[PDB]
A paper describes a structure:
The protein Pgp3 is implicated in the sexually transmitted disease chlamydia and comprises an extended complex arrangement of a C-terminal domain (CTD) and an N-terminal domain (NTD) linked by a triple-helix coiled coil (THCC). One of these, the Pgp3 protein, is transcribed from the CDS5 gene. This protein is both associated with the bacterial outer membrane and secreted into the cell cytosol, and is thought to be a virulence and in vivo fitness factor supporting Ct infection. X-ray crystallographic studies of Pgp3 from a genotype D strain of Ct have been reported at a resolution limit of 3.1 Å by Galaleldeen et al., establishing that the 84 kDa Pgp3 trimer is comprised of globular N- and C-terminal domains connected by a triple-helical coiled coil (THCC). Recently, Hou et al. reported that Pgp3, specifically its central region, neutralizes the activity of cathelicidin LL-37, an antichlamydial peptide secreted by epithelial cells and neutrophils in the human genital tract.
Here, the X-ray crystal structure of Pgp3 from an LGV1 strain is reported at the highest X-ray diffraction resolution obtained to date for the full protein. The protein was crystallized using a high concentration of potassium bromide, which resulted in a new crystal form with relatively low solvent content that diffracted to a resolution of 1.98 Å. Since the threefold axes of the THCC and NTD are not collinear with the threefold axis of a CTD, this naturally leads to disorder in the THCC and the portion of the NTD that does not directly interact with the CTD via crystal packing. c and anomalous difference electron density derived from diffraction data measured on the high-energy side of the Br K-edge peak to enhance the bromine signal, as well as the local structural environment of each peak, a total of 28 bromide ion-binding sites have been identified in our study. A total of 28 such ions were identified. These are basically all in the CTD. The most common form of interaction is via a hydrogen bond to a peptide NH. Our LGV1 isolate Pgp3 crystal structure shows where amino-acid changes actually occur (Q12E, T39K, P61S, D86N, Q90D, R138S, Y191C, R210S and I212T) compared with the Pgp3 crystal structure reported by Galaleldeen et al.. Of special importance is the lattice interaction that is observed in both crystals involving the three Phe6 residues on the fairly flat NTD surface and one of the Trp234 residues on the curved surface of the CTD.
Residue numbers in the entry:
A (entry chain A): 2 to 19, 100 to 260
B (entry chain B): 2 to 17, 100 to 261
C (entry chain C): 4 to 19, 109 to 261
């Protein structure tokens, strides 16, 4: 109940009362998923004279036959295998052909197979499976020679000449599979 | 029309998801991402006295059994791609191979090979149509074409080839048709 | 401080499963060949790099499901001929010579003659291939039959050509 104007020090004042990509990277790089599988095919087109023999004395060493190819492969999944197919065009005077797949570091062949030529070229095959031991590149080589005796030519007639006058192709394929 | 001060009642106032897919993908048989593989090595030497003839080719009695294999598909509506790669010798002549599915009364698939006397690879390549996800058994029989004795994994006299044990293989790879 | 007029008014104042690019998705096709075919066409140095060598025994159409894929091809043909060489050639439609050539053998009795290769796919479109078989230089070759054209073991036999899609490294 009071109102008006008044001085406060020096002021005159009024006053008053008022996710797809994320899978994709996993899938293409996670080795533990059994998805995803390496494949490699290795053509062999050169004519190779295989003078090295296979015999009981060298069959369990590295010295049997003649090397015709060397292959490096890498698994993309853990605990996998490679299903291996070697299909080699070979000729020899009537007799047996031996094939040996060797894994680098071992002291003898990983797998041995047998083929035949009558004198004219014939496919000689090795089919096997490799047990992979990690995700590291691994190198394998294929050797080919006569069974006990004879010279074997790969990709050529028994004298070394071109079959049918052309270059021919033998193949070694590796297909990764999960057991 | 006014300014000043006034009383109002008593007041004086102024105014103026990844794991969820991954479990599916790694276990669902209907998607077709899961593919079985099995390889069966055969390393024993087996004398195959049983023959294949027109009278026994469509029975279970042709040739001699060299292996029996049990496999399980992981996907529905799948097939197995089969490769049997058998080392065999015989005196000059033909070799017959027959894959039999358990329960059937004759071979599923038949193939042919050759030996001149020295060992040679004899193969059978086929595809099997799978009918569920249950283990299934198959067997491989080998014998002469019409006549002759066939040795598997051995020379024509039963001895070791090159003095070692040799390996024949039968592989089954699961694949999905289109 | 006080009150004053500002204009008219009186105022207070104061100071305060379908993506091809992955690639899961792998086609498989198998083509059984069960007819007996008398392959009178020969392979010679003069026809080996043409379309005319041998005799066609099958034609296959396949479709890749993934990009930058290959088909792993296996042709496993039952064949007989009087003592000698068998030649197989896989041809891709539109080419003017074989994509791959392989060799087999018969002594007179049937034997498996194989061709194993890989094909490089170039898209996701159906593509047609064919297989041709014939003698090496001379001789008649019978597919799925004895060297005289009769049934082997008195039954129908089956040769196969398979295509399996795979993805290279
Ligand atoms: Br490749
Ligand atoms: Br020796
Ligand atoms: Br052969
Ligand atoms: Br296995
Ligand atoms: Br009979
Ligand atoms: Br059985
Ligand atoms: Br049946
Ligand atoms: Br022995
Ligand atoms: Br199919
Ligand atoms: Br047909
Ligand atoms: Br064509
Ligand atoms: Br061309
Ligand atoms: Br017969
Ligand atoms: Br694959
Ligand atoms: K021989
Ligand atoms: K090596
Ligand atoms: K012969």
């Amino acid at each position: 109940g009071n109102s008006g104007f008044y001085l406060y020090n020096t002021q005159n004042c009024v006053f008053a009362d008022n996710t797809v990509q994320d899978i994709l990277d996993k899938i293409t790089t996670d080795p533990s998923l059994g998805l995803l599988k390496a494949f490699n095919n290795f053509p062999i087109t050169n004519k190779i004279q295989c003078n090295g023999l296979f015999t009981p004395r060298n069959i369990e060493t590295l010295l049997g036959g003649t090397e015709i190819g060397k292959f490096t492969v890498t698994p993309k999944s853990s605990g996998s295998m490679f299903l291996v197919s070697a299909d080699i065009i070979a000729s020899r005077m009537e007799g047996g052909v031996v094939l040996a797949l060797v894994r680098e570091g071992d002291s003898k062949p990983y797998a041995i197979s047998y083929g035949y030529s009558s004198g004219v070229p014939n496919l000689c095959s090795l089919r096997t499976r490799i047990i992979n031991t990690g995700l590291t590149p691994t190198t394998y080589s294929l050797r080919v020679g006569g069974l006990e005796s004879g010279v074997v030519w790969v990709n050529a007639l028994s004298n070394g000449n071109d079959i049918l006058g052309i270059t021919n192709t033998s193949n070694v394929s590796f297909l990764e599979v999960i057991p």
